[PDB]
């Protein structure tokens, strides 16, 4: 009848949890025009705003729980016929300032999820919006301005007959939050970088294509009388020379109808595009099945004889660049019964057994990505 | 002490400001936002200024959360004045905010003919986990400002801010920034 | 709305009042801990009201209708009761906050937490009188002071 | 990365439960005039409508759970000085029809 | 030693005094009561003075019993004078009482054109339990005074007293004080 | 600090440069390649220069790979000028490359009548195994340059670079060099 | 080094001597008997002198046998002279006897406009058990003299001798002394 209200469980201070049904707080609709192009920013806004007109089971809980302990999980849904494809990317960054760059390179360093709707019919990932700790809250990510940007990293090889829509689902899951803090130890066993190496575009044809990506990754991605950088890339630039086991992620961003066999290897800038014996070096051969979109290259410490410069003078000619390069070469030829280039995305995920050597006084600028 | 104390480490040049050209001659000041990388003279600009892109400066401008110690060295270069006529003075103020209600965190007062060097360190420590997001509206966080007052802009020519991270520096999270303009170091001649 | 950024002191006319303990905690730039409050029923026992206490930010409106969607406590005093103790655990605060905020900081821009006292139903009595409560931060358990506070002159009004 | 969405726990068919904080779906304000009299109907409406402009932790769950298995709990809060009193009554009936009687008895 | 020794920590500005305006020109002095926060010129006031409210200053003024070390830094700012005409000197005296019978606890003597910085520490240790109540009639306790003599008020412009608590500082008991007037830091321009 | 800090160890004189003779008088600079042993004025030579053959200088010029710390001491000798007319300043820049895109590794700014001494250390650390081959095209390796700017060649007479190996210095491999010319130390009179 | 090194401890003022009044102007000197507390100018007195009674000074004058370290600080206050005309120099000599056959135990040479501070320590160690009785005819024991030479009595005004016992100081035995005259510290104005 009459109760001691002070005693009731009204001060329940726990994080949100439950089935995925009860644990969902918002959904988002992103429109992919039938002519999106790559560079195209599809949706860019503060993460918090994602929870606006929402009325799902965990919406109120997401907003009223002071300390949320689980991770955010995003699930994207969309899919196109097997003769088309493209590459989308959902990224999270702790903040934005000014008329910021929304290039793949700039946005993919912190937390990103990148897929090809022609190969995958949904894609999800979880993230901690507070890199320094193990908890966050709606008020915190709001006031601290956490950004959520979705871009077309590469457009449709063959346009769908209509504009397409991707549905984002935001839920809180019971995984634990963990910090991703960077420090100045010369040796670290895993330095996550997520440094974008570039978008390789190979035209269909009997021609011979060679792509050279420099491993002297200091500075950033080149731009017009400017350069773009992000925290992880800037961090590794602190070191004068570096070395380690490199881990790369290659994404098939073109439709599965465009086929080619690429071979990856490590060599120096001075080999010519016509060099006929690239396969006399240790190398890997990559081919993607229809449904496959990702590949992982690991170049061990036995592929590099010494450390190399973190950054080289911008005006350094290929013939004079004494640091190694990741080479992407077409083994046979690019083909397809449809028109389109064969586009690959390449990202240096991180370095295992990283070793930074000496302080880098710095060089202004960086070669073009 | 004629004998000089040995300096060491690599301190890279971050930002530099030069006093208003002749015949300007009132006491004037410029304030550096040591963390976000912004220079702001007092309104009587033509305090020709520059921000460089050494590694430390790019980490400072893209790193969302910071925690650690920063070692600074202020180099003061002066006009060529007979020592006997020198009257210049630089007043240095390190503070966390420019509102008049805030008090200085540290204050230096130098006055020597031609050139002078000032060394001090300070450390970033915030609410996130000893991490601080420069001026985030979040816990009403803050930044670190270095206000420099040139008492005679005709004798004191420019202020050069050199910085270096202590080994204990840590950083977390990234900030989407616009492209960084090339800004090669203006030579000494 | 009572601000938890308690640095400085109690505001006064172009002045502020402080005491040793308040001045001491002001030495720290940011702080955090389990807060212990003591609420005293200072009005006659004939004036009745149910107050609910919670921790939230400055920007909720007086008209916000869903304060009880936040973790909170509900206080009612029996005739003879005059004191109540609120303990806000570390799980009510996600990070540390500023010991002191600039005096001119608007409610909508104050990024530090506040202790909120809200009337759950209505104040009543068959006698005239206001319902007066006294509130005191007794101490902090597991106190954590972070960094040196260079200081801000002045404090919002108590 | 890619998952079998059919397998996820989206078809969670369970009743609402949790602390009283998470288990609350609505609040209602009833006004007792300083001259109420007895017979006075203070609030009379369909139970369901009680959940209208509500935005508490269990509001959506209350509305979207197909089979709720627990009981509804109502808590009333109000109090007057010890020299006064009155008697209030909150009642629930499965239905109404016509210009019904709202007498205590009924 | 051209190379500068690295300074650090946060020292907040407590009280400041500026010399009598022109044409005043006799040797003049002002004495700071470092602990109770009081400034007292020698009678020929118009030594424009100020007391600020940084955290340390409010602890010092409300804390009844104190025990620990206080780190001080005297910044001396001067008028704009050709170095060649400089003749100013500052004489600094740290003492526990102003009665003439008491001797100085420490004495400094500086003399350099324009600006100068002086750093010293001193520590409060009393009869209560190593605790001292500034000038309590109790064990005939005492306070700490900093007397500064400007030898040429036309060249030496102002004295700024910066203080900082050593980590070993401890305090006990409270003192009922009247309200503290807002006293925002007078800017450098 | 009238009291001098005790200096020690053996630092041998490596290379010396003297400013252009009268009536030359523009700001001029000379840059030392500390590791390969090369002096380079800015074009307005008649910066009379010299390289000596002390042990350290011969190891530096024949040792292919180097790893370790080098302790430097810059002695600045000036013309005989009334102190009251002195206006000279030396700006020192330690850098790894002379391309304008490279930033300074360390910067000093001195200005004192007649003579001055500057002490700093820096350390060679490369890609071979902490070993570095000065400017080898190999890992786009580098060297260490010391640029000195004499602001008034009529007051600042010469720059003397003194070096000393830290005990941690290591070296490997040999470089075929042409014969080394005798270069006996030019006496002080 | 604009940055000042932190001073600390309590050094109490022991004895002070001021140079002969105008128009006196030859080089003149005064010698302090640091241990027995005696001041002796060179014959051209009107070196106005004083001995104070701080605790340390009374222990020094009544303690028969002494053993330990004494920390001294010489403060030199000067007349008000345009820096540009300053030519004064102080030559300091610490010795155990004034006979010409004895050599100096330590010698300092300072020269700076207006004011200057000199810090040095020395330690009493004798034949009794590391104990020494100042000038006892016993083992032909000795005392400690501080001779100060003012090179221009018109620019260098006075010498102030400040002392402090090191914690290792020990004393034994008492000396029957006549009463000590009150000698309150002459104020700075």
UniProtKB/Swiss-Prot annotation, chains B, E, F, G:
Q: Where in the cell is it found?
A: Virion
Q: How is it modified after translation?
A: Not glycosylated.
UniProt effect for mutating residue 147 to R = Complete loss of capsid assembly
The source's superkingdom equals Viruses
Mutagenesis or variant effect for residue 109 to W: Loss of capsid assembly
* Domain text: Contains a beta-sheet structure called beta-barrel jelly roll.
User: What does the UniProt record say this protein does?
Assistant: Together with the large capsid protein, forms an icosahedral capsid (T=3) enclosing the viral positive strand RNA genome, with a diameter of approximately 300 Angstroms. The capsid is formed from 60 copies each of the large and the small capsid protein. The mature small capsid protein forms the turrets at the fivefold axes of the viral particle.
- Complex formation: Interacts with the large capsid protein.
Name-wise, this protein is Mature small capsid protein
Per the UniProt record, the source organism is Cowpea mosaic virus (strain SB) (CPMV)
Q: Which residues of the full protein are shown?
A: 834 to 1022 of 1046
């Amino acid at each position: 009848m009459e109760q001691n209200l002070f005693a009731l469980s009204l001060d329940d201070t726990s994080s949100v949890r439950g089935s995925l049904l009860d644990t969902k707080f918002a959904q988002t609709r992103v429109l992919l025009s039938k002519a999106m192009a790559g560079g195209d920013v599809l949706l860019d806004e503060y993460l918090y705003d994602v929870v606006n007109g929402q009325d799902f089971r965990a919406t109120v809980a997401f907003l009223r729980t002071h300390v949320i302990t689980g991770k955010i999980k995003v699930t994207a849904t969309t899919n196109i016929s097997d003769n088309s494809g493209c590459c989308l990317m959902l990224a999270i960054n702790s903040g934005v300032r000014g008329k910021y760059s929304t290039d793949v390179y700039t946005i993919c360093s912190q937390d990103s999820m990148t897929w090809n709707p022609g190969c995958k019919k949904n894609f999800s990932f979880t993230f901690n919006p507070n890199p320094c700790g193990d908890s966050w809250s709606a008020e915190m990510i709001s006031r601290s301005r956490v950004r959520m940007t979705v871009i077309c990293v590469s457009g449709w090889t063959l346009s769908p007959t209509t504009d397409v829509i991707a549905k984002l689902d935001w839920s809180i899951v019971n995984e634990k939050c963990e910090p991703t803090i960077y420090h100045l130890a010369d040796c670290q066993n895993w330095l996550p970088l997520n440094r974008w190496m570039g978008k390789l575009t190979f035209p269909q044809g009997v021609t011979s294509e060679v792509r050279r990506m420099p491993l002297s990754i200091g500075g950033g991605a080149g731009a017009t009388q400017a350069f773009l950088a992000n925290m992880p890339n800037s961090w590794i630039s602190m070191w004068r020379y570096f070395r380690g086991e490199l881990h790369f992620e290659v994404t098939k961003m073109s439709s599965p109808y465009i086929k080619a066999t690429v071979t990856f290897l490590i060599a120096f800038g001075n080999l010519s595009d016509a060099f006929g014996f690239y396969e006399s070096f240790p190398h890997r051969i990559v081919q993607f099945a229809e449904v496959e979109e990702k590949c992982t290259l690991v170049f061990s410490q036995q592929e590099f004889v010494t450390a190399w410069s973190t950054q080289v003078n911008p005006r350094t000619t290929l013939e004079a660049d004494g640091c190694p390069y990741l080479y992407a070469i077409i083994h046979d030829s690019t083909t397809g019964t449809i028109s389109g280039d064969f586009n690959l995305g390449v990202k240096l995920v991180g370095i295992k057994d990283f070793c930074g050597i000496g302080s880098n006084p710095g060089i202004d600028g960086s070669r073009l990505l | 002490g004629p004998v000089c104390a040995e300096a060491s480490d690599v301190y890279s040049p971050c930002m530099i400001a030069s006093t208003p050209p002749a015949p300007f001659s009132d006491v004037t000041a410029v304030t550096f936002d040591l963390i976000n990388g912004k220079i702001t003279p007092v309104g009587d600009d033509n305090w020709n200024t520059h921000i460089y892109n050494p590694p430390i400066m790019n980490v400072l401008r893209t790193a969302a959360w910071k925690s650690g110690t920063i070692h600074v060295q202020l180099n003061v270069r002066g006009a060529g004045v007979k020592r006997a006529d020198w009257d210049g003075q630089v007043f240095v103020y390190l503070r966390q905010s420019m509102n008049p209600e805030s008090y200085d965190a540290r204050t230096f007062v130098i006055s020597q003919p031609g050139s002078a060097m000032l060394n001090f360190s300070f450390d970033i420590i915030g609410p996130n986990s000893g991490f601080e997001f420069a001026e985030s509206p979040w816990a009403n966080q803050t930044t670190w400002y270095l206000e420099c007052v040139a008492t005679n802009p005709r004798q004191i020519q420019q202020f050069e801010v050199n910085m270096r991270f202590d080994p204990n520096f840590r950083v977390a999270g990234n900030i989407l920034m616009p492209p960084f303009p090339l800004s090669t170091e203006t030579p000494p001649l």
